[PDB]
Write a protein that binds this ligand. Structure first.
Ligand SMILES: O=C(O)c1ccccc1O
Ligand SMILES: O=C(O)c1ccccc1O
Lengths: 97, 91
């Protein structure tokens, strides 16, 4: 995997983009492992959506986006979506267990 | 970070989830560098069309719902295409 400035054409660019997208998928898959592990440390079902934790999480991700040359609303939006889905998945996991 | 099974409480879980979320942001930041580098070689229709099912498959292989993951990548790919177009027009 070449650095962007050493990419010689679109084959190199795409190999690197494929690797980075797969890394993101694999990281989301590991993230689910952690979210499911959380379910045993939840006092109750009402504990799941942990609103102070989520409330703080999104602006922190918006800050990381700004520190990584990305538009904050785009990245904060993506994480709102991921967090929503993972909460729903945790609630599903907690209910079926 | 501890593995999920070795996490002892929500402190451990959160530390690991924050480090993973930071990893994803950092990776998206690197991804932009590649999309901007590509500009000199735009919506590349056949490329997008093939990429999405590939990401759906990776999702299935990592125990995530494919529609949710494919939907995220559809959004990511649209945003980056626009940013590549912006970069190409601005330069
Ligand atoms: O996905 C998360 O990071 C999350 C945050 C707070 C509560 C439940 C969750 O799944
Ligand atoms: O983000 C992408 O993966 C992409 C793919 C094809 C063309 C332009 C792009 O930004």
């Amino acid at each position: 995997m070449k650095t962007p400035e050493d990419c010689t054409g679109l084959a190199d660019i795409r190999e690197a983009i494929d690797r980075i997208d797969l890394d993101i998928v694999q990281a989301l898959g590991r993230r689910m492992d952690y979210v499911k592990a959380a379910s045993r440390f939840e006092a109750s079902e009402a504990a799941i959506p942990a609103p102070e934790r989520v409330a703080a999480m999104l602006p922190e991700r918006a800050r990381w986006a700004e520190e990584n040359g990305l538009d904050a609303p785009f990245v904060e939006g993506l994480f709102a979506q991921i967090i929503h889905w993972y909460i729903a998945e945790q609630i599903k996991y907690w209910r079926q267990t």
